[PDB]
Write a protein that binds this ligand. Structure first.
Ligand SMILES: CCCCCCCC(=O)OC[C@H](COP(=O)(O)O[C@@H]1[C@H](O)[C@H](O)[C@@H](OP(=O)(O)O)[C@H](OP(=O)(O)O)[C@H]1O)OC(=O)CCCCCCC
Ligand SMILES: CCCCCCCC(=O)OC[C@H](COP(=O)(O)O[C@@H]1[C@H](O)[C@H](O)[C@@H](OP(=O)(O)O)[C@H](OP(=O)(O)O)[C@H]1O)OC(=O)CCCCCCC
Lengths: 606, 606, 63
């Protein structure tokens, strides 16, 4: 909790203010500080609230002269860092690098202060609480704040380039993690000026990500363009048009299981979809989608449509037989009931249904064999919650397979009430065909804005519906507890009083009006108010709200359609035979250029 | 009424035009004015329509040379002010200060004219009629128009700094009351350069408001930031990020009962909600809301939801008994009537209802004990009319408590007709759960734009709608007054003819169509025109008006949600136990900095 | 000159006509419709001409 950091900061100000030496270092006044240097009664190695020395204070307040005076007073004092909880290993050389003082950093490296010191405090590790993530190293701080002479001075004074923190990120990862600053891109070249003998570009962190993959997942599009200046080279040009080949070795990532594009499209960050429109990614996945992704996705979409046709014509003809006992009940409808399994398969039409039943059961088996390892391989909250990878549809297809498997369980036990799981499966599965509607460019993002409205608008509006239909349903019920349920029985008991007020809210069921009897006088008053506040006011406010949400999607239609086709292209890249999915790009081993696969695109500029 | 001021202005022009001396002072011609100085037959102390002298006219028309000519001719004439109704104390020094004439002001203070003269007329006091509020003092006029040399000349020539008018405002208040002019802020610095020994910053007006509090209630954001350039100080900086502490002593205002934030959020001025987003105000109420305001508001919201659940399941099971007299009536619905209290509590389920009845009555008591002092402490029109402080919900909760207490009155008197107070209480109280819907950031401003549509759109459209359903209802009644009420009885008598035309306007009830009888030929003509003008034209126009006001709110959603959570945060700051609501901010008495409470925030700039 | 499509510069040239109008006056003579030029500027929507016409009628009495 962040109030502890406030308490530590003004406790630091307390320990500065109590000590005359730390106050003299803060205020930048040499007059009493000379006497503080001269006398041996005072202790120069005194601690702050955290462990900040006088050198830490004089580095923090841009006071180089008092800092250098106390380094002539104590040359050994520079190497000791802080030792409390928010600053576990903070040296003042980190502060002087971060404040971009060239003379103070030069004096600190001239007196032999530590350059490989890890500042492993909680303030320097990344969090929503800390406003910056500058790293844990001085070379990290120098390359991350945007200073050139300081970082080259740190190169010439030791400071080995490979520096993995507690998160395991090196300098390039947390040079990428800045909020899209252009000039640090050039300073990336400075790091690539001094990377020598694997290389720094290929070392992963504790998450297991290449810096190129970190630029992919974090949405740093300017750094992605700067990185693909190095990989590409033009092979010929004529007139306005150039042809250049991009290296897809770390785009496709054929050796690695967890691919680069899987890190791009399943990123939690919103800005990681503008990197998916770039010049070596868009042409590659467009070639994958047009050459392979759309035909295999279309034949799987036709196969699932035919599977649901073969399921609905199987469950329409379900075993049903006439009930043995008579009805003898007013307010009741029943002609026929469920059929026992001993007579459910007696004719040829029952066998034609039965082979369809085995088709549906093996369809459930091949659905859950394609989801349970897939939900295990990435996690539950990663895959169900992601709207780009079809997670709301992938919980629906799993619910289908569990429901029709439960229907097969219930049928062999020969117990009744199989209308309910068959009805949920039959209504959820035909809505899962929208999962196969992401492939078409015409009707693609309509399915993403439908789920966007379900999870955005109608999760906030459902609680404002349930304070109106509950109150008005309860108000309509009291006016018709006194009266009869025969002439006007739309509010007879309270569940149908809720349901009728819900339908009257939705303007589907007509208003409860029996003009052949005298209605209660309160009912017209409390229903006129309902027609004002609910059918007129509350509903069409939500309808215009849906229109605003539809406008919000429709300004960015292609940006989500391309993300949807990337998600399904890399999902059909996995789970599919290798002979039926050859490697995208052209090989280049027979062209003598190496065992790296490339992609040639040609453009047209002035 | 403002035509009197026009009559006074042209009567002033009359009294200028009749007198040759005042005409010569207006026209700035010295030729006959020399003879007017020379002769003793004319009276130099003559009056205008109000009391304006000729030196008043020469100050009014930037005629400094003629003013100095009669000012050598009459040195004592400068001190007399005007003496009729709109200018009861206006001197010419006020006019010369207001017109920024440096030489005339220097001459007027050189001849000993009064500098503490109070111009307490109706034109100088604030009103919608007067276009400016420059104050009542010369120092007021000089600071308020924004002239530096004039106000410093007034400081060196007397003019004590504390100058409270008939409204009681000093100079700083009516420097703040300007229409957001930036440069007067620097003029404010001049006053705070010359304020010495309480101070001028802490003296209140007759309303009882600090100039800090007047800056808060008037929405002057630039003055508010300029005031907090003095209060704040940075305690440390490193790299891009500074940590600074703000003084919340006059923000939280712990000693004063009527707090500062209560003056900000209950301000009638629209521009006082952009000052609620400022850099220590947003963080203070966000700390109050996240640390305390949201959990106690959520547990009160759950307690009120459970209280309404325990009230609706109490009144659904209300006592009713089978009636003794038989129906014997066509066009009537009745099975059963209300139950007497002597048999209303006979079983264990009646006792389970009865403890819920005492829960609801004590809930009404603890509601009206939390509203009647609260409506008395701020007034009726201040609290019910303010839409930010939940006033439309606070009249609804009061109406609920009065209605269920009227139910408690009616039930012990054992008289019938108790369906109506339960029906009004049960429709109003579940709509008051929207009052607890202001807390959530997801579903917050929906409940403010619903009341915005009720009080904006359906106040104007109902008068346009009650001249269509009245005329068409009367037109439908005449076409079916000739006919029967059995085969088509939707317009049998005139109340249900109004109600059916209302429902047909809302398109809930179907059109009156009985195809098994010959309808009147006028009815199809006057119902086809109804389907044009009412169902098609006026309804969907009002839907488009809802779309426009929905867009108008949705551009400024967060600005009202933050004001709503400020309103409920300062409502739960009051009326709640002190041990459960500690003082927000950190103490600082143990940090030796004084008995003032602060708030440290850190920012991130370049 | 009023019937132009809202051209500003002939406004000043209107002053030229009122520089040489002498002895009723040209400002008050009507057409066959029976309209004053002030009324023609009113009915044709020439707002710049109307403002320029109201520069001459108005005068400030105090400031
Ligand atoms: C279908 C069954 C449910 C599927 C479960 C998986 C459901 C699912 O995939 O979304 C998770 C959703 C949060 O959405 P999620 O984490 O994906 O992130 C939001 C998403 O990107 C929306 O599209 C964004 O627009 P909007 O503002 O929303 O318009 C929204 O804001 P922004 O990016 O524009 O700034 C993003 O925050 O949480 C629920 O409401 C579910 C409650 C019901 C849980 C019911 C549990 C059964
Ligand atoms: C719930 C029971 C009634 C609660 C009583 C308290 C009702 C209440 O709190 O509002 C008072 C309201 C005036 O609204 P009010 O004084 O608060 O000021 C208006 C308010 O700020 C609106 O939100 C603004 O938008 P809109 O243009 O409106 O969209 C409007 O214009 P603007 O700021 O945008 O320029 C502001 O003028 O007057 C009535 O219509 C009530 C008639 C029915 C009186 C019924 C008396 C029982």
């Amino acid at each position: 909790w962040e109030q502890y950091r406030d308490r530590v900061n003004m406790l630091q100000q307390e320990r500065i203010r109590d000590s005359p030496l730390l106050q003299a270092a803060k205020e930048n006044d040499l007059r009493l500080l000379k006497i503080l240097l001269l006398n041996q009664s005072c202790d120069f190695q005194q601690r702050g609230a955290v462990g900040e020395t006088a050198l830490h204070v004089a580095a923090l307040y841009d006071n180089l002269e008092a800092a250098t005076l106390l380094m002539e007073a104590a040359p050994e004092l520079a190497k000791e860092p802080a030792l409390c909880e928010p600053f576990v290993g903070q040296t003042a050389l980190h502060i002087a690098v971060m404040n971009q003082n060239l003379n103070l950093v030069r004096a600190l490296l001239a007196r032999g202060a530590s350059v490989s010191a890890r500042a492993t405090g909680a303030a320097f590790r990344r969090s929503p609480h800390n406003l910056i993530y500058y790293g844990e190293h001085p070379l990290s701080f120098a390359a991350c704040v945007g200073s050139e002479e300081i970082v080259r001075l740190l190169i010439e004074h030791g400071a080995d380039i490979r520096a993995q923190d507690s998160l395991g990120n090196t300098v390039l990862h947390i040079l990428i993690l800045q909020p899209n600053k252009t000039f640090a891109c050039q300073m990336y070249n400075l790091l690539l000026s001094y990377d020598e003998h694997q290389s720094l570009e290929l070392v992963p962190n504790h998450q297991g990500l290449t810096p190129f993959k970190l630029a992919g997942v974090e949405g740093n599009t300017v750094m992605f363009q700067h990185l693909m200046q190095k990989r590409k080279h033009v092979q010929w040009t004529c007139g306005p048009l150039t042809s250049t080949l991009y290296d897809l070795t770390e785009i496709d990532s054929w050796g690695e299981e967890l691919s680069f594009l899987e890190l791009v499209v399943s990123s939690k960050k919103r800005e990681a979809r503008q990197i998916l429109e770039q010049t070596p990614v868009k042409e590659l996945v467009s070639f994958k989608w047009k050459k392979y992704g759309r035909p295999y996705f279309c034949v799987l979409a036709s196969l699932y449509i035919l599977y649901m046709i073969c399921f609905t014509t199987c469950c329409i003809y379900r075993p049903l037989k006439l009930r043995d006992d008579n009805r003898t009940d007013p307010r009741d409808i029943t002609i026929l009931q469920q059929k026992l399994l001993q007579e459910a398969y007696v004719t040829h039409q029952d066998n034609i249904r039965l082979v369809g039943e085995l088709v549906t059961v093996t369809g459930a088996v091949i659905i859950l064999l394609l989801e349970i390892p897939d939900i295990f391989r990435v996690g539950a909250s990663r895959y169900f919650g992601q709207t780009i990878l079809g997670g709301p549809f992938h919980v629906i297809i799993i619910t289908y397979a569990s429901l029709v498997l439960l229907t097969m369980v219930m049928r062999l036990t020969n117990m009744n009430g199989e209308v309910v799981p068959l009805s949920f499966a039959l209504v959820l599965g035909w809505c899962s065909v929208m999962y196969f509607a992401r492939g078409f460019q015409m009707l693609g993002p309509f399915t993403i804005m439908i789920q966007k409205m379900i999870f955005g608008d109608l999760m906030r509006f459902c609680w404002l519906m349930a304070v109106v239909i509950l109150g008005f349903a309860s108000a309509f019920h009291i006016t018709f507890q006194t009266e009869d349920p025969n002439n006007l029985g739309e509010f007879s008991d309270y569940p149908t009083a809720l349901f009728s007020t819900f339908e009257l809210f939705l303007t589907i069921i007509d208003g409860p009006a029996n003009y052949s009897v005298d209605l209660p006088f309160m009912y017209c008053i409390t229903y006129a108010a309902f027609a004002i506040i609910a059918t007129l006011l509350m509903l069409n406010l939500f309808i215009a709200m849906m229109g605003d949400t539809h406008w919000r999607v429709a300004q960015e239609r292609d940006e989500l359609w391309r993300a949807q086709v990337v998600a399904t292209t890399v999902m059909l890249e996995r789970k599919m035979p290798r002979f039926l999915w050859p490697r995208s790009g052209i090989c280049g081993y027979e062209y003598g250029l190496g065992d790296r696969w490339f992609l040639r695109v040609e453009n047209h500029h002035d």
